[PDB]
Amino acid sequence: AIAHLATEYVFSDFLGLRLELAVDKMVTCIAVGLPLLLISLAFAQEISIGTQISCFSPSSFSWRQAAFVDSYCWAAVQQKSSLQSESGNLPLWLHKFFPYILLLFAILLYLPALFWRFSAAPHLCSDLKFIMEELDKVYNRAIKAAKSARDPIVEQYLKTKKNSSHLIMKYISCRLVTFVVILLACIYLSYYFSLSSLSDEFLCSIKSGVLKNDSTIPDRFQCKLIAVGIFQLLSLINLIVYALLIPVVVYTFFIPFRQKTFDVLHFKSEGYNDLSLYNLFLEENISELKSYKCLKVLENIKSNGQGIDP
Amino acid sequence: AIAHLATEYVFSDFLGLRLELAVDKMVTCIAVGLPLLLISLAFAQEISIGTQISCFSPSSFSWRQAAFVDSYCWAAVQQKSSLQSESGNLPLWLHKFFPYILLLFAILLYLPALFWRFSAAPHLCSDLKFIMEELDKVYNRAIKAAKSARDPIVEQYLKTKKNSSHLIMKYISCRLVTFVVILLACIYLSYYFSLSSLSDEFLCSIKSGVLKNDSTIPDRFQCKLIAVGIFQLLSLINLIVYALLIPVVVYTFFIPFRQKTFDVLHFKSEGYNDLSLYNLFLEENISELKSYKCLKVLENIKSNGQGIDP
Amino acid sequence: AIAHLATEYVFSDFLGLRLELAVDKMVTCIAVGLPLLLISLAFAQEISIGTQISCFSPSSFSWRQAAFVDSYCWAAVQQKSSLQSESGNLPLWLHKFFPYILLLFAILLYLPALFWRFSAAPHLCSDLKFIMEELDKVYNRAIKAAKSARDPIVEQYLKTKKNSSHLIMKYISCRLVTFVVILLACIYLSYYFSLSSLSDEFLCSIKSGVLKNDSTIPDRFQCKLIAVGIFQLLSLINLIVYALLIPVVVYTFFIPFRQKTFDVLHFKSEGYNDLSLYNLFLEENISELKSYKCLKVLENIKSNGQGIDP
Amino acid sequence: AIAHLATEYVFSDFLGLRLELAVDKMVTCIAVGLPLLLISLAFAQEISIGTQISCFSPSSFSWRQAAFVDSYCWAAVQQKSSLQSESGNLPLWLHKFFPYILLLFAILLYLPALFWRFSAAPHLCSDLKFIMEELDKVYNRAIKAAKSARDPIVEQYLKTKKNSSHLIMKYISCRLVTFVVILLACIYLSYYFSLSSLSDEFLCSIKSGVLKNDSTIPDRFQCKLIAVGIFQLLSLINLIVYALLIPVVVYTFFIPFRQKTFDVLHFKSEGYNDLSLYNLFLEENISELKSYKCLKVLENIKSNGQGIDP
Amino acid sequence: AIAHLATEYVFSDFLGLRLELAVDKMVTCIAVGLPLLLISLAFAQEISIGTQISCFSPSSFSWRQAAFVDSYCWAAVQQKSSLQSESGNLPLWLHKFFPYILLLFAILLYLPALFWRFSAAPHLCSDLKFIMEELDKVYNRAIKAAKSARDPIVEQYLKTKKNSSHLIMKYISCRLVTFVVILLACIYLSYYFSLSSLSDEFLCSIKSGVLKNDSTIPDRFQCKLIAVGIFQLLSLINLIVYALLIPVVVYTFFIPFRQKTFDVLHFKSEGYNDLSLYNLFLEENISELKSYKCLKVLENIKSNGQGIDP
Ligand SMILES: CC(C)CCC[C@@H](C)[C@H]1CC[C@H]2[C@@H]3CC=C4C[C@@H](OC(=O)CCC(=O)O)CC[C@]4(C)[C@H]3CC[C@]12C
Ligand SMILES: CC(C)CCC[C@@H](C)[C@H]1CC[C@H]2[C@@H]3CC=C4C[C@@H](OC(=O)CCC(=O)O)CC[C@]4(C)[C@H]3CC[C@]12C
Ligand SMILES: CC(C)CCC[C@@H](C)[C@H]1CC[C@H]2[C@@H]3CC=C4C[C@@H](OC(=O)CCC(=O)O)CC[C@]4(C)[C@H]3CC[C@]12C
Ligand SMILES: CC(C)CCC[C@@H](C)[C@H]1CC[C@H]2[C@@H]3CC=C4C[C@@H](OC(=O)CCC(=O)O)CC[C@]4(C)[C@H]3CC[C@]12C
Ligand SMILES: CC(C)CCC[C@@H](C)[C@H]1CC[C@H]2[C@@H]3CC=C4C[C@@H](OC(=O)CCC(=O)O)CC[C@]4(C)[C@H]3CC[C@]12C
Ligand SMILES: CC(C)CCC[C@@H](C)[C@H]1CC[C@H]2[C@@H]3CC=C4C[C@@H](OC(=O)CCC(=O)O)CC[C@]4(C)[C@H]3CC[C@]12C
Ligand SMILES: CC(C)CCC[C@@H](C)[C@H]1CC[C@H]2[C@@H]3CC=C4C[C@@H](OC(=O)CCC(=O)O)CC[C@]4(C)[C@H]3CC[C@]12C
Ligand SMILES: CC(C)CCC[C@@H](C)[C@H]1CC[C@H]2[C@@H]3CC=C4C[C@@H](OC(=O)CCC(=O)O)CC[C@]4(C)[C@H]3CC[C@]12C
Ligand SMILES: CC(C)CCC[C@@H](C)[C@H]1CC[C@H]2[C@@H]3CC=C4C[C@@H](OC(=O)CCC(=O)O)CC[C@]4(C)[C@H]3CC[C@]12C
Ligand SMILES: CC(C)CCC[C@@H](C)[C@H]1CC[C@H]2[C@@H]3CC=C4C[C@@H](OC(=O)CCC(=O)O)CC[C@]4(C)[C@H]3CC[C@]12C
């Protein structure tokens, strides 16, 4: 089934205008997708031995009595009054709930993208639909002029956007939340990887109620959480990748402000202003226009040779 | 399978004109969707140990006798004459039926949306289809006038709607029922989370009938409900999210009345009147009209620069 | 799997012209759909403990001998000569066949709708197709007259329908059968809910044939039907909903006769006559005509303001 | 199920313009696809005996005690304090994680192709769409001239590409990473195949905690990893194929530079320059143009017979 | 499930222009398809008894000790130091890996077809698309001439192909590899069928490590490979069919050279030259042309009666 997981989570896509930037979409796919793969691998039948916990019951216990001990101690992992270990009870909770914790990170990293799709993409879509179709008319006019010579509402409207700073707050906050959640996940995963491997072993007791006086039951059962060594291993993989995402996410703060007389071909940064976002989103969309490509071909020729000024 | 649950309930949509407001639809998706995820996680094989209850049968019992005790005590959870516990029998019922109780909340939170789709959306759809197509003619006429100058049935009909107050009662009652059900669910979930963790343990007896005289059977069996610690944990997650929905739902009462010379571009609140609903539903639909977008572009330019009055 | 059941039976639809009235279709979906959900929930793995019956075999019985007792007593539930209980054998039959009894109600409540689709909808469809297309011509003519002035075969044919009383008998009988089946189901479900919870316990004997003389076999085995407490619980849910459907179904008898100079816009009741049905079915279909909507807009304006008589 | 694996991974394709060269795509399909097949075959039910590990527990151990030993020793494979073997613990880790290691190679060999699809194919696609449609006009003009006689923007633009050397770095680095990962996989697989077959046997001890003093438990359990002989066998198959891919990948470094007055029919190598890539990508795409095929037919005739110069 | 296998592998097809000759495609479907069916039948539940190996453990061994012996001896089949048999260890390897060996033949017989689809079909497709459309013009002209009378680039181009001998090497080598692999499979299958039926029985020992001194374990366990009698039976079926394919494959060497003033209707062999391949591929494609069929009808009439010379 491991090969099906690779087909589902790596070799196929999951989770019109481009209303998300390619880098931001790519980071989201890695950040959300990787925990779901690692959860699926942690319980693959190739690696699983069929149970999360086993306890050494005495030889006199019947098969159902030993099955009770395993089931009770799986519940007792939450119940401080009936546990003992080389450390506190906290590792045992983390070892049990490791699958839910990775799922929680996957969800929390998806919510910023879902919010952008809910709260910002509809407005941006309606604007990009307008701006691109009017830019196409401007480019077709420029082509006809150049082709004849050598064989302003958009400008006004775009100049309004640098006054607005509306979407830039929605964008930067979506980036900033993604950064914080990745950083917190790195802190957790490095802690969980640091836990002693023998923190998977604990002592359990069933002598809570009517059993409390029964001399035939031993006072402590040795139990082991069988998958914990795999969980810690896969936590290192997740930590490595998330540490590599942190530089990329930080770069997405400065891509609008710096890194990416009015010019309708050269989209450029304009500061902490929505026009900087529209410049990014146009540059990832304007290349679909046939007329833009023709003018950029002429500009590249003029940059190298015959002076067909664009 | 946990990764499939995330794909099914988070990373894909489940449960023409927009006949429900985006916030109301979003709240419904969270309120109905979250219990179904949490039910599915509570019985995930990654976390389950294969049975809901285990009882400590004595060593002399055969395998089938011990299987009888577990099956009888699962039934006896409902049967006051054969239970004993540190508290009343009520916790044991809640621990058993936790999956049905979350399912009940999911259903009860869907019924207001289903009623709106049944009782109000058909009438509203027929009106919005009419109003938008006639508004498009008004806008196209205004564009042609403005483009020529600078390079009333709808008004009468809409003025009838502020007399009707028909749909506003259907809408506000759907909001109000959703509020009440979320509030009652919060009261339950906070109670269920408050129950002692050892309320998962109870004493069972099989000595009802012919077995009543059998000296070989112990008078009480120790039983434990194994999943209860997970149910209480997931109840905290559900309580947290529903407490965050309450402010959002309350805001949906005042969005029509306040928060959202006749003006065909600026849709506005008009009180406890159906025109306030039509203003909300138009504002979420009118942005699809090409002619509306052009006039709003001119209005934005006029707001910032050249006085092309819309 | 409980979440899949909710997706299948609540959050999605199951079981052109509208040839069934919305209320009648809605009642049918609830009446037929609810038993199928409740059956599915009664055997959900979240709530099931893997067997319907368990009997306490003695400790000397082998594993296969105890498996024989459970299998024999499941069959013996039908066989009066080998049962004993605190009451008659009738409860034990109902406890065993509870799933089939709910299935039987679901089927019997679907047959009236299936009969309407078989015996009445084809004729009604051919008439509504004719009447609506000729009404559209009448409305378009009235619009052109009104638009010019202020900027009869259908009547003859419809007047024939009030003489026919053909379909009204088919309709009312389909309603009446649905009422009777819901009422009988309420009587059963309230009886089944009233049965003592300990009617799930009975005494079984295997000493029929060659075993009759065997002194090593006990004369009675204690058996318990494990799911019965869930069946009675879910029977209360079904009883509550069906009791709420009864008022709605009764209202569907009087919707044609009363509640819903010839007027082609105001469809109205005409007594125990097929024209009353055609008036109901037109009123649920005529709103799709663009020309009808225009005339109703003018009528609403005339009702409030400028006297553009429709 | 083995026949389904062959259908899925051999007899069907998995993982517009041709934006990847056929040889590079073919190598990627083999390099990524083969580990996924071999993983799937290693756990086929035809060959599996249902468990990864078995340990010889003593005859006095109960069934659940022996199940504990197997589960503990599967976990102990990671835990140096409780292992002994004829060699170090490293082989035991490799034997356990063989499925993940092959999966890791499959992923690492896919990432270069995914990067090309992300970072280079969009720009190349926009250029090839332009260049081919303008070349089609040049060829149609040449056909009309030749057909009449015997019954420059593209040149300027392409001459800019040999100045750029932009895509050649992206391409060669994708090839170079693929080479390195295949070489490292060959080093691992030849090492893993070289491990002694009896490295699948190790000695395990459960005497860690409360069990440490128990005289009834033997100090060492003999355990065997059952699948290891299959893993080493399939590692030889993977090593053989990857060794055959190495010559092919190396050839893909020199295909642009050498091996593959301006001529619009004969695409040719131009050095370490992007024009060399465009020449390769055009030659794999230009054959779709009807006008190119006609001119190549005339060129082939002129090469053999009547001098219809192309 | 056997009936599903027949539906999947016999009664349905698996694995535009015809770019493979019908006989060559048919041989490939049999040669590749038959092993996959026979593998699937060898493990059908109708015939399988649920395990590949069973060993006779002594009566004192616990259930888990006997499960260890079976699992160890399945691994020991590869491990010469712990086997004994009436012959060498080679039969035991073949009995274990019979499913992989048949899979290997299925794959090796598919690779020649995959290579033809990769390396030759694209060029041939581009030529056949050209040649057929120009032949259609020649035939339509000949029809119009004949219909009027009685109520050369292609020739030049095709005459170039007999100089090329390019594709004939690719074709004959694909045929020759298919012949060699079928012949080698026949040699193996006849050997494997010849092995003694009691070669499925071998003696196993677990006394490798700590167990080496244990006097309670017998020195040899009798083991039997349960499916081997089915594998040898199905090997006879595979051998019979492959022996019948050998004559057909050999005939495909001489179909181009012999067996199958320029004539545009009668495609004919021209020696070891690509024109011989084009003649074969045209003859399997030219019959789709309406104009060809008309001329062949006239030729058949002229062959029998009225002299309408084609
Ligand atoms: C043992 C350790 C030290 C080796 C080095 C770390 C690897 C295990 C890391 C490095 C890059 C990682 C990969 C980076 C990107 C992806 C793609 C991601 O899928 C997508 O983003 C899909 C994108 C699309 O389809 O558009 C799934 C996880 C995966 C394979 C990551 C899995 C883990 C990888 C291979
Ligand atoms: C289902 C998904 C979407 C959410 C999963 C959330 C859980 C992974 C969280 C919620 C509640 C958390 C627990 C709340 C309470 C505790 C007890 C607390 O215990 C101690 O400090 C014990 C110290 C001692 O041993 O004395 C440590 C954190 C822990 C385990 C938390 C660990 C993480 C948990 C299980
Ligand atoms: C351990 C606790 C203290 C951490 C904080 C609480 C989280 C567990 C909460 C906060 C927000 C919650 C999420 C808010 C919104 C959604 C979306 C919801 O899906 C949809 O609404 C789909 C919408 C669409 O697809 O259009 C499913 C539940 C989920 C993931 C919620 C799951 C639980 C979350 C992550
Ligand atoms: C299948 C879905 C759609 C609906 C599920 C509904 C149930 C979750 C409801 C319906 C009937 C309810 C029960 C009706 C009767 C009782 C007994 C009652 O018992 C006591 O008060 C016991 C006190 C004592 O111990 O003396 C407490 C509430 C309880 C468990 C209720 C809990 C919630 C139940 C099970
Ligand atoms: C514990 C008791 C006392 C609480 C109160 C009773 C509820 C359990 C009842 C009240 C309304 C009932 C619901 C009324 C309507 C429906 C819709 C029905 O589905 C449809 O009719 C689908 C309609 C469509 O999709 O068009 C399925 C049963 C359900 C959820 C019913 C399930 C049981 C509900 C929630
Ligand atoms: C498969 C679906 C579509 C139909 C299911 C129909 C059953 C649920 C019906 C048909 C025959 C009925 C039974 C016919 C005979 C009997 C025996 C009869 O027994 C007594 O009166 C016993 C009195 C005593 O204990 O002395 C009570 C009704 C009962 C159980 C009936 C209960 C309901 C049954 C099982
Ligand atoms: C026992 C050993 C010594 C025999 C010789 C080695 C074989 C086991 C090798 C030689 C060629 C290999 C094959 C080369 C190519 C492929 C195609 C590959 O699938 C694709 O590339 C799909 C291509 C497409 O569909 O476009 C899957 C692996 C496979 C069958 C390889 C499987 C292993 C093979 C048969
Ligand atoms: C889930 C997929 C995508 C990634 C799988 C990565 C693993 C296969 C890697 C990551 C960590 C690696 C391990 C990290 C630590 C060790 C311990 C180390 O131990 C010794 O050197 C023991 C020497 C002794 O016996 O004294 C040898 C390498 C090994 C097994 C490594 C083998 C390969 C592992 C398991
Ligand atoms: C017991 C022995 C001595 C009887 C004689 C041998 C048969 C078992 C052989 C003779 C012909 C064989 C068949 C020849 C052709 C085919 C078709 C082949 O499927 C295809 O080629 C599909 C073709 C398509 O669908 O286009 C699958 C194997 C099968 C049924 C072969 C199965 C084995 C058969 C029946
Ligand atoms: C997974 C698919 C695609 C490929 C399957 C390939 C195997 C079926 C091949 C590869 C390695 C081969 C084995 C390599 C080594 C040996 C040991 C060799 O042993 C002896 O000669 C033993 C003599 C003695 O008993 O003393 C005999 C051939 C054999 C079993 C070979 C049989 C066929 C094998 C298992």
CSV table of N, CA and C in Angstrom, one decimal, chain E residues 40-108:
chain,number,residue,atom,x,y,z
E,40,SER,N,-2.7,-15.5,-11.5
E,40,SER,CA,-3.9,-15.2,-10.8
E,40,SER,C,-4.7,-16.5,-10.5
E,41,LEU,N,-4.8,-17.5,-11.4
E,41,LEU,CA,-5.4,-18.8,-11.1
E,41,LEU,C,-4.7,-19.6,-10.0
E,42,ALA,N,-3.3,-19.5,-10.0
E,42,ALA,CA,-2.6,-20.3,-9.1
E,42,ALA,C,-2.9,-20.0,-7.6
E,43,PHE,N,-3.3,-18.8,-7.4
E,43,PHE,CA,-3.7,-18.3,-6.0
E,43,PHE,C,-5.1,-18.0,-5.8
E,44,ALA,N,-6.0,-18.5,-6.7
E,44,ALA,CA,-7.4,-18.3,-6.5
E,44,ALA,C,-7.9,-19.0,-5.3
E,45,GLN,N,-8.8,-18.4,-4.6
E,45,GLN,CA,-9.3,-18.9,-3.3
E,45,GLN,C,-10.1,-20.2,-3.5
E,46,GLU,N,-10.6,-20.4,-4.7
E,46,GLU,CA,-11.3,-21.7,-5.0
E,46,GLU,C,-10.3,-22.8,-4.9
E,47,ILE,N,-9.0,-22.6,-5.2
E,47,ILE,CA,-8.0,-23.6,-5.2
E,47,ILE,C,-7.0,-23.6,-4.1
E,48,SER,N,-6.8,-22.4,-3.5
E,48,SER,CA,-5.9,-22.2,-2.4
E,48,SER,C,-6.5,-22.7,-1.1
E,49,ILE,N,-5.6,-23.2,-0.2
E,49,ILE,CA,-6.0,-23.6,1.1
E,49,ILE,C,-5.3,-22.7,2.2
E,50,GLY,N,-4.9,-21.5,1.8
E,50,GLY,CA,-4.6,-20.4,2.7
E,50,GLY,C,-3.2,-20.3,3.1
E,51,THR,N,-2.3,-21.2,2.8
E,51,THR,CA,-0.9,-21.0,3.1
E,51,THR,C,0.0,-21.7,2.1
E,52,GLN,N,1.2,-21.1,1.9
E,52,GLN,CA,2.1,-21.7,0.9
E,52,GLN,C,2.9,-22.9,1.5
E,53,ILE,N,3.1,-22.9,2.8
E,53,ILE,CA,4.0,-23.9,3.4
E,53,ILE,C,3.3,-24.4,4.7
E,54,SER,N,3.5,-25.6,5.1
E,54,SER,CA,3.2,-26.2,6.4
E,54,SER,C,4.2,-27.1,6.8
E,55,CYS,N,4.6,-27.1,8.1
E,55,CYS,CA,5.6,-28.0,8.7
E,55,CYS,C,4.9,-28.7,9.9
E,56,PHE,N,5.3,-30.0,10.0
E,56,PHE,CA,4.8,-30.8,11.1
E,56,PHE,C,5.6,-30.5,12.4
E,57,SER,N,5.1,-29.6,13.2
E,57,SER,CA,5.7,-29.3,14.5
E,57,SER,C,5.2,-30.4,15.5
E,58,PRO,N,6.0,-30.7,16.5
E,58,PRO,CA,5.7,-31.7,17.5
E,58,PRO,C,4.5,-31.2,18.4
E,59,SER,N,3.9,-32.2,19.1
E,59,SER,CA,2.6,-31.9,19.8
E,59,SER,C,2.9,-31.1,21.0
E,60,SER,N,4.1,-31.1,21.6
E,60,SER,CA,4.4,-30.2,22.7
E,60,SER,C,4.6,-28.8,22.4
E,61,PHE,N,4.9,-28.5,21.1
E,61,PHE,CA,5.0,-27.1,20.7
E,61,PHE,C,3.7,-26.3,20.9
E,62,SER,N,3.8,-25.1,21.5
E,62,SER,CA,2.7,-24.2,21.5
E,62,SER,C,2.4,-23.7,20.1
E,63,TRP,N,1.2,-23.0,20.0
E,63,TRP,CA,0.7,-22.5,18.8
E,63,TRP,C,1.7,-21.5,18.1
E,64,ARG,N,2.3,-20.6,19.0
E,64,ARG,CA,3.2,-19.7,18.5
E,64,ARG,C,4.6,-20.3,18.1
E,65,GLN,N,5.0,-21.3,18.8
E,65,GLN,CA,6.2,-22.1,18.4
E,65,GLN,C,6.1,-22.7,17.1
E,66,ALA,N,4.9,-23.4,16.8
E,66,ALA,CA,4.6,-24.0,15.5
E,66,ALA,C,4.6,-22.9,14.4
E,67,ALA,N,4.0,-21.7,14.7
E,67,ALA,CA,4.0,-20.6,13.8
E,67,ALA,C,5.4,-20.1,13.5
E,68,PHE,N,6.3,-20.2,14.5
E,68,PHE,CA,7.7,-19.8,14.2
E,68,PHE,C,8.3,-20.8,13.2
E,69,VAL,N,8.1,-22.1,13.4
E,69,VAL,CA,8.7,-23.1,12.5
E,69,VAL,C,8.3,-22.8,11.1
E,70,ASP,N,7.0,-22.6,10.8
E,70,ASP,CA,6.5,-22.3,9.5
E,70,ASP,C,7.2,-21.1,8.9
E,71,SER,N,7.2,-20.0,9.7
E,71,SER,CA,7.8,-18.8,9.2
E,71,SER,C,9.3,-18.9,9.0
E,72,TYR,N,10.0,-19.5,9.9
E,72,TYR,CA,11.5,-19.7,9.7
E,72,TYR,C,11.8,-20.6,8.5
E,73,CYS,N,11.1,-21.7,8.3
E,73,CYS,CA,11.4,-22.5,7.2
E,73,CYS,C,11.0,-21.9,5.8
E,74,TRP,N,10.0,-21.1,5.8
E,74,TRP,CA,9.8,-20.3,4.6
E,74,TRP,C,11.0,-19.4,4.3
E,75,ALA,N,11.6,-18.8,5.3
E,75,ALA,CA,12.8,-18.0,5.0
E,75,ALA,C,14.0,-18.9,4.8
E,76,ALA,N,14.1,-20.1,5.4
E,76,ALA,CA,15.2,-21.0,5.3
E,76,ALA,C,15.3,-21.6,3.9
E,77,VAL,N,14.2,-21.6,3.1
E,77,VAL,CA,14.2,-22.1,1.7
E,77,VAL,C,15.3,-21.5,0.9
E,78,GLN,N,15.7,-20.2,1.3
E,78,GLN,CA,16.9,-19.6,0.6
E,78,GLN,C,18.2,-19.9,1.2
E,79,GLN,N,18.3,-20.6,2.4
E,79,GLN,CA,19.4,-20.6,3.2
E,79,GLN,C,20.0,-22.0,3.3
E,80,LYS,N,21.0,-22.3,2.5
E,80,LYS,CA,21.5,-23.6,2.2
E,80,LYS,C,22.0,-24.3,3.5
E,81,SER,N,22.5,-23.5,4.5
E,81,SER,CA,23.0,-24.1,5.7
E,81,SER,C,21.9,-24.8,6.6
E,82,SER,N,20.6,-24.6,6.3
E,82,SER,CA,19.6,-25.1,7.2
E,82,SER,C,18.5,-25.9,6.4
E,83,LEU,N,18.9,-26.4,5.2
E,83,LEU,CA,18.0,-27.2,4.4
E,83,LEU,C,18.6,-28.6,4.1
E,84,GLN,N,17.7,-29.6,3.9
E,84,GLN,CA,18.0,-30.8,3.3
E,84,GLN,C,16.9,-31.3,2.4
E,85,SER,N,17.2,-32.0,1.4
E,85,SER,CA,16.1,-32.5,0.4
E,85,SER,C,16.7,-33.7,-0.3
E,86,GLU,N,15.7,-34.3,-1.1
E,86,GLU,CA,16.1,-35.5,-1.9
E,86,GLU,C,17.0,-35.0,-3.1
E,87,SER,N,17.1,-33.7,-3.4
E,87,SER,CA,17.9,-33.2,-4.4
E,87,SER,C,18.5,-31.9,-3.9
E,88,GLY,N,19.1,-31.1,-4.8
E,88,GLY,CA,19.7,-29.8,-4.4
E,88,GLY,C,18.6,-28.8,-3.9
E,89,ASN,N,19.1,-27.7,-3.5
E,89,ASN,CA,18.1,-26.6,-3.1
E,89,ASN,C,17.5,-25.9,-4.2
E,90,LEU,N,18.0,-26.0,-5.4
E,90,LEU,CA,17.4,-25.2,-6.6
E,90,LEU,C,15.9,-25.4,-6.7
E,91,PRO,N,15.3,-26.6,-6.7
E,91,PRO,CA,13.9,-26.7,-6.8
E,91,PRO,C,13.1,-25.9,-5.8
E,92,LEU,N,13.6,-25.8,-4.6
E,92,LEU,CA,12.9,-25.1,-3.5
E,92,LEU,C,12.8,-23.6,-3.8
E,93,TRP,N,13.9,-23.0,-4.4
E,93,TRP,CA,13.9,-21.7,-4.9
E,93,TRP,C,12.8,-21.4,-6.0
E,94,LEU,N,12.8,-22.3,-6.9
E,94,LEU,CA,11.9,-22.2,-8.1
E,94,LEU,C,10.4,-22.4,-7.6
E,95,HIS,N,10.2,-23.3,-6.7
E,95,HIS,CA,8.9,-23.5,-6.1
E,95,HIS,C,8.4,-22.2,-5.3
E,96,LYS,N,9.3,-21.6,-4.6
E,96,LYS,CA,9.0,-20.3,-3.9
E,96,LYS,C,8.7,-19.2,-4.9
E,97,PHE,N,9.6,-19.0,-5.8
E,97,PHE,CA,9.6,-17.8,-6.7
E,97,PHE,C,8.8,-18.0,-8.0
E,98,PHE,N,8.1,-19.1,-8.2
E,98,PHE,CA,7.3,-19.4,-9.4
E,98,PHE,C,6.5,-18.2,-9.8
E,99,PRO,N,5.8,-17.5,-8.9
E,99,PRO,CA,5.0,-16.3,-9.3
E,99,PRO,C,5.8,-15.2,-9.9
E,100,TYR,N,7.0,-14.9,-9.3
E,100,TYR,CA,7.9,-13.9,-9.9
E,100,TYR,C,8.5,-14.3,-11.2
E,101,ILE,N,8.8,-15.5,-11.4
E,101,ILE,CA,9.4,-16.0,-12.7
E,101,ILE,C,8.4,-15.8,-13.8
E,102,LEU,N,7.1,-16.2,-13.6
E,102,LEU,CA,6.1,-15.9,-14.6
E,102,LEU,C,5.9,-14.4,-14.9
E,103,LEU,N,5.9,-13.6,-13.8
E,103,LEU,CA,5.8,-12.2,-14.0
E,103,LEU,C,7.0,-11.6,-14.8
E,104,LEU,N,8.2,-12.2,-14.5
E,104,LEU,CA,9.4,-11.7,-15.3
E,104,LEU,C,9.2,-12.0,-16.8
E,105,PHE,N,8.7,-13.2,-17.2
E,105,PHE,CA,8.5,-13.5,-18.6
E,105,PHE,C,7.4,-12.5,-19.2
E,106,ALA,N,6.3,-12.3,-18.5
E,106,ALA,CA,5.3,-11.3,-18.9
E,106,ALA,C,5.9,-10.0,-19.2
E,107,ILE,N,6.8,-9.5,-18.3
E,107,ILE,CA,7.4,-8.2,-18.5
E,107,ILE,C,8.4,-8.2,-19.7
E,108,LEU,N,9.3,-9.2,-19.7
E,108,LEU,CA,10.3,-9.3,-20.8
E,108,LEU,C,9.7,-9.4,-22.2
